[PDB]
């Protein structure tokens, strides 16, 4: 209890003592990541159906 309320305060001190970036910068870095990897994502950028296991691919290992 008095142990476990000093444990909280010590932990909160850890959480306060980080430093942070603007949400504007954060959002931009995510948006930039998606655009960099848009062509690699088959759910956005479909690949040819003969290379898709679940469409038309016949040969496998």
């Amino acid at each position: 209890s008095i142990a476990q309320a000093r444990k909280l305060v010590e932990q909160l001190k850890m959480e306060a003592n980080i430093d942070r970036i603007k949400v504007s910068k954060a959002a931009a870095d995510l948006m930039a990541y998606c655009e960099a990897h848009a062509k690699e994502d088959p759910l956005l950028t479909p690949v040819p159906a003969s290379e898709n296991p679940f469409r038309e691919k016949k040969f496998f290992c």
Partner: protein
Amino acid sequence: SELDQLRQEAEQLKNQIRDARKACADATLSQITNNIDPVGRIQMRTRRTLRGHLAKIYAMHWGTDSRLLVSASQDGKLIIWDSYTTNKVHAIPLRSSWVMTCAYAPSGNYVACGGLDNICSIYNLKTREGNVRVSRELAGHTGYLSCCRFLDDNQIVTSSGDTTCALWDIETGQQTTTFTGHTGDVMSLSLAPDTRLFVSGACDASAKLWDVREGMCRQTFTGHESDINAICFFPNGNAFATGSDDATCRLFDLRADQELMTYSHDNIICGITSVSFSKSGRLLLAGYDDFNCNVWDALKADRAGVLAGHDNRVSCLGVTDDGMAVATGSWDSFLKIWN
């Protein structure tokens, strides 16, 4: 006096946190993403139904080859499937009927599972005698196994209803590190790409970011009004999403240390069971207790599509590493592969 003087300090600290967070909130992700094209209508269809489980499915996890996956079920079994052909690679009947979760090791040599037995149980998939057998029962949790994930063949993280998470050395069978801090049942964990950190979501309605190597909570995320049932890292490891009983998912950025977006809809009243991003991060797929899985534009918050196939809860989902396929597990007893 001391319980007062510390609880008075607890708020002034909690304030500093709200205020520092507010200091960063100079714009919103939806403002930043406002100018980019929508993804348009994402219409995926069922390309496989996996049959074999005789009851509810609770959990599923793709192998890193994007081909096999494990499923954990109320029928007391794990099933390892070849999603390309529909064949069962293995059917593993368990010692305890009450499994809730299952994991496939990155190597492919091992799977893990457990539940109300309170024991994460490791199965060796390629023995010297060509059989499937238990290589290890990891005891130590005093509550149910809710979720687990391998780092490598000899290390696994577990989340429990005892409110702790833990990292194990499989060979010695001991908790290397315990992650205490949650004040309610932990329900999911997800590992960051580099296995340096991980996040957990609990029934205290918070998510916590842990340092695996050190064994401590670095950041704590709130906003949700109800249990967090599921969690997931965005592919670059700077953010994660959560699924809650409050009918919302949320995006949380590590370095801003706050919520960036909510994904919800007045017409969606029920809770989210599972979550995962597409490979690029652009789509957030979430499974619901209304039998569907919704596909969200993670950057714009729009709803892009729906996977509507199951006849009961979607209870788990995964996207493959090659990003070709989505798997959904359901209380209807079938898995389905979509794309």
